[PDB]
Write a protein that binds this DNA or RNA. Structure first.
Ligand SMILES: [Mg+2]
Ligand SMILES: [Mg+2]
Ligand SMILES: [Mg+2]
Ligand SMILES: [Mg+2]
Ligand SMILES: [Mg+2]
Ligand SMILES: [Mg+2]
Ligand SMILES: [Mg+2]
Ligand SMILES: [Mg+2]
Ligand SMILES: [Mg+2]
Ligand SMILES: [Mg+2]
Ligand SMILES: [Mg+2]
Ligand SMILES: [Mg+2]
Ligand SMILES: [Mg+2]
Ligand SMILES: [Mg+2]
Ligand SMILES: [Mg+2]
Ligand SMILES: [Mg+2]
Ligand SMILES: [Mg+2]
Ligand SMILES: [Mg+2]
Ligand SMILES: [Mg+2]
Ligand SMILES: [Mg+2]
Ligand SMILES: [Mg+2]
Ligand SMILES: [Mg+2]
Ligand SMILES: [Mg+2]
Ligand SMILES: [Mg+2]
Ligand SMILES: [Mg+2]
Ligand SMILES: [Mg+2]
Ligand SMILES: [Mg+2]
Ligand SMILES: [Mg+2]
Ligand SMILES: [Mg+2]
Ligand SMILES: [Mg+2]
Ligand SMILES: [Mg+2]
Ligand SMILES: [Mg+2]
Ligand SMILES: [Mg+2]
Ligand SMILES: [Mg+2]
Ligand SMILES: [Mg+2]
Ligand SMILES: [Mg+2]
Ligand SMILES: [Mg+2]
Ligand SMILES: [Mg+2]
Lengths: 66, 87, 79, 204
RNA sequence: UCUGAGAGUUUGAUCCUGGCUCAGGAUUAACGCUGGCGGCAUGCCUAAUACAUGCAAGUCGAUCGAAAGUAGUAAUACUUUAGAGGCGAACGGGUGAGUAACACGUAUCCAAUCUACCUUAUAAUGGGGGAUAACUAGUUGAAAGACUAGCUAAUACCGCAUAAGAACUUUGGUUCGCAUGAAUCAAAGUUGAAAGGACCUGCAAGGGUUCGUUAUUUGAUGAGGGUGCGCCAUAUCAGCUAGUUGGUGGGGUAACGGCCUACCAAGGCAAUGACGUGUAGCUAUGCUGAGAAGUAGAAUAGCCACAAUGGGACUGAGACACGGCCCAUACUCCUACGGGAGGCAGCAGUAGGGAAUUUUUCACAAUGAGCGAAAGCUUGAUGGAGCAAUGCCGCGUGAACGAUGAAGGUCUUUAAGAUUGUAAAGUUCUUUUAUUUGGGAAGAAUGACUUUAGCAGGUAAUGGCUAGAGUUUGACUGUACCAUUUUGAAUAAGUGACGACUAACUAUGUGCCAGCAGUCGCGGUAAUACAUAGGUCGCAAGCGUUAUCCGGAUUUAUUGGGCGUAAAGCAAGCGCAGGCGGAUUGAAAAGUCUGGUGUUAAAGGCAGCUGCUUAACAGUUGUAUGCAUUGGAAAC
């Protein structure tokens, strides 16, 4: 929302990003890629959740199987 | 224009008052000059631990009480001492 | 967005300003006449206007006092 | 709010609620740590943190307490005079639901908590519903009358088996308590004092 | 009587220097998953961005004319208020934009000040005059209004007589001071006040209580000024200042003052940091720390500043005035196109910005304010109720009995077996929660007012003072809570982790692919680090992740570190200012120590106690720190 361009890793297996989309970044720092220092909160706004996940879901954003 | 009056310092659904000499234009629950003594709406008896010392000085100085403030003075008998000291 | 008390107060102060301005102008013209053709006679009139205005509040009481003291200094120097 | 598998946690730590009712059982007389990975090696040499945390759980599971409640009580007892190693033991054993079980009017500790929560217990001069009130030796904690007739009073009225620190005046169910519990009435299930130091690091 | 925990990580392995990360707390928090309730508290950190709509300061007929309405044959009785007048609208509420300095905290001197109402005490409250609101009529308009001419009233306004005391001077005394200078007279000169209302008695005349007024007197509160000390970063900002420095006479201000003026001069500040830049409301305090201190200035409380932006002034005791006035700028809106209206940083709410922060609520019932004799009246202050796990605290999803082992799931030590697991199934019990029934408060354990009783002043009457009786008043509220009230386990468990730091491991799938990660690092076809499953562990109506602050960090080391080989001794010297410095004697007492007094607002801090079922919380008493003044000590 400011005027800063940051390279943010999409933390998960599979994404719906289509070059033009809105994301809700958080804090972090992936050690493999140099320069990346942010993570995308999954399953919050336009970005979808990470289904097919039953472990540590509260972090990736998946509705309780119930 | 010192005015002996109250100041609410309790909590939700539980008031608690303190007789205190304060100016008229100062907000309630703000700054004051001298402490007289506290009050409790539900202390059953002795509800007003009065001072009986500086209060007479401030009333002699010309402090104007309030309706509820005056009320407290009368059951103990402070009104009597003030009026007879005036006389 | 307006209060009758405020509106009424404005309407009253116009009339008060007119009357007080008249009183102030008399004092100004009187002290100037006095110090013009200096004469112990005038001095009295100066006292009357200054004291009267000071009581009514129109003029701050201290200004009347300083005017009174200072005007009397000129007479003693000249007499 | 509590676990519903007390056998499992008692089997893990190894110590039950002092009658071995959850250890004897009617089956297999199992005294191994639960789960598939119970009959393995690497038994001893628990780190200081490991044994301290295991021991800390023992203290707060013997009574059905939440750790946050434990921190509150420790913060309370810490400040007073000095080496208060006689006070917090009385404080930890002063729980109201704990006293009813030591009173001999409940089959189990957490069942006594349920009766406390349901309003079947009284106090010297008032009534008690919350199962956390800190008691002081001297209060005539008299039992209810409409609960003396309920279809579960039989073992309840069998309080002849009672600890010496809970005096009842048997058959009158007065149930006061004096002569605070010595370490003898606090068995080797949890009898250590460096758990206090564990909370000293974690809780100021 | 205080009072401090460490570990992982460079190397084939070791020691040291050294940086990074973690274990603990905390917030005005946000996000993901999940979600039952109650007691407290908090809740636009961003756009001082713009605002629809509705409320947020009025009151007195016991100041005054008139008008209107209801009764009355009338005289008149009662009620109501547009307007004149008094008082209050400068309090209270909100926001922190600006501000780096007497803004603020602290201690002070105001011989350099004000203060309406309030306190005490002391003289008066006599008599006249001229006007204008409301009203009528006319012009101009849809209306707001505006203009013109007449009519009235006073506690509105303006003269006059009168000064107990006042103010300004004159005459010499007094007591003097800190330099200007104050303090007190005795006499004199000069100057200067106002208004009545209500009620009782009295044939009347007259008298009286009370409210109010003028002139004073005492204090006190509140406001204003000056000064010492403390109070950010930056030299990759070295000169700044021409009303700036001083004197003279004058003007102005509540007051001193280049605050202003005319003249005479050339100074003032600055390396002990001026000036400039950037940033920021300050403080009591919040979080953290063993301590020294670091950090943010939530809530609330003191002080300052501001009210769309920038100026000016009236009224007033007090404003240069948030919801008063005038002007300009910007912006929006209405119009019948001539003219106007506007300021939510008051309570909600809307739009927008944001990762993100609530009712377009009820009542003055309690506390507080303004006006009133009371009746009262006005109070988005205030008190409640909504909303939100936002934080702290508390309670629940059940109790007993119950297989040397139901089914299912996961491993099978290839029949056996384990493990989930008293978990479950099943037999009984209870209802904090949940659904009916009956009762039902606390706050209003106050009260103002109005008939009585008594005292009490003055007394010829009325008001004030205590007791009893009454009207006695509730938004919360048929709410908290209570009872053998019906039904019934019925209405209630999630999240992180399991290689080490760090409590807790196996299988399946994948095969340097998909993915994890706070650090070391896992994945190249036998992965306890990935995905799924079972088990287990850490928490719990909360759990993780992210952001920020402190500790750990002795990692800016005064307390409390180093400079040969690890970062760090200028290439060396002459050296002003600064810092330090031989021995003895005397005085003073600036440091230093100690006694007395004043102050350091309240809340918070620590200890004790009380009250809420205990707690959280609220109240209660205690509890320092520094500064100034005064009296001593004399070792350095
Ligand atoms: Mg004036
Ligand atoms: Mg290595
Ligand atoms: Mg940590
Ligand atoms: Mg009216
Ligand atoms: Mg105003
Ligand atoms: Mg204001
Ligand atoms: Mg407020
Ligand atoms: Mg704000
Ligand atoms: Mg006044
Ligand atoms: Mg007249
Ligand atoms: Mg005259
Ligand atoms: Mg008059
Ligand atoms: Mg000069
Ligand atoms: Mg700012
Ligand atoms: Mg430290
Ligand atoms: Mg604050
Ligand atoms: Mg703030
Ligand atoms: Mg406004
Ligand atoms: Mg608002
Ligand atoms: Mg505004
Ligand atoms: Mg009220
Ligand atoms: Mg909560
Ligand atoms: Mg809790
Ligand atoms: Mg059971
Ligand atoms: Mg099987
Ligand atoms: Mg009541
Ligand atoms: Mg993971
Ligand atoms: Mg795994
Ligand atoms: Mg640190
Ligand atoms: Mg440090
Ligand atoms: Mg070092
Ligand atoms: Mg070197
Ligand atoms: Mg050298
Ligand atoms: Mg060198
Ligand atoms: Mg030399
Ligand atoms: Mg030298
Ligand atoms: Mg204090
Ligand atoms: Mg408190």
């Amino acid at each position: 929302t400011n005027g800063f361009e940051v390279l943010t890793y999409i933390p998960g297996e599979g994404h719906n990003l289509q070059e033009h989309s809105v994301t809700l970044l958080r804090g972090g720092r992936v050690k493999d890629l140099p320069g990346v220092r942010y993570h995308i909160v999954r399953g919050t706004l336009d970005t979808v959740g990470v289904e097919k996940r039953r472990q540590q879901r509260s972090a990736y954003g998946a509705k309780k199987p119930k | 224009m010192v005015k002996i009056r109250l100041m609410r310092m309790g909590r939700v659904h539980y008031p608690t008052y303190r007789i205190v000499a304060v100016d008229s234009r100062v907000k309630r629950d703000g700054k004051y000059i001298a402490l007289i003594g506290h009050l409790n709406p539900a202390l059953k008896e002795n509800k007003c631990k009065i001072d009986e010392a500086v209060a007479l000085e401030w009333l002699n100085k010309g402090a104007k009480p309030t309706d509820t403030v005056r009320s407290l003075f009368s059951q103990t008998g402070l009104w009597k001492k003030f009026v007879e000291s005036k006389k | 967005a307006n209060i009758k008390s405020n509106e009424k107060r404005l309407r009253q102060n116009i009339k008060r300003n007119l009357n007080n301005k008249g009183q102030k102008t008399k004092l100004k013209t009187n002290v100037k006449n006095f110090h013009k053709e200096i004469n112990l006679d005038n001095l009295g009139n100066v006292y009357s206007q200054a004291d009267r205005l000071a009581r009514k509040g129109i003029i701050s009481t201290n200004r009347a006092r300083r005017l009174k003291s200072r005007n009397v200094a000129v007479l003693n120097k000249t007499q | 709010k509590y676990t519903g598998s007390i056998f499992k946690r008692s089997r893990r730590l190894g110590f039950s609620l002092l009658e071995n009712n959850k250890e004897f059982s009617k089956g297999k007389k199992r005294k191994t740590i639960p789960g598939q990975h119970g009959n393995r090696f690497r038994s001893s040499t628990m780190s200081g943190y490991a044994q301290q945390l295991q021991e800390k759980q023992r203290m707060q599971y013997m009574y059905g307490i939440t750790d946050k409640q434990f921190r509150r009580l420790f913060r309370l007892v810490l400040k007073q005079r000095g080496n208060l190693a006689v006070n917090l033991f009385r404080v930890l054993e002063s729980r109201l639901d704990n006293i009813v079980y030591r009173m001999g009017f409940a089959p189990t500790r957490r069942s006594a908590r349920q009766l406390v929560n349901h309003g079947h217990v009284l106090l010297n001069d008032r009534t008690v519903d919350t199962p956390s009130i800190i008691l002081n030796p001297g209060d005539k904690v008299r039992l209810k009358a409409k609960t003396i007739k309920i279809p579960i009073v039989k073992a309840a009225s069998e309080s002849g088996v009672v600890s010496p620190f809970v005096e009842t005046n048997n058959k009158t169910f007065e149930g006061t308590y004096v002569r605070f519990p010595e370490r003898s009435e606090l068995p080797a299930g949890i009898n250590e004092s460096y758990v206090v130091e564990w909370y000293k690091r974690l809780v100021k």
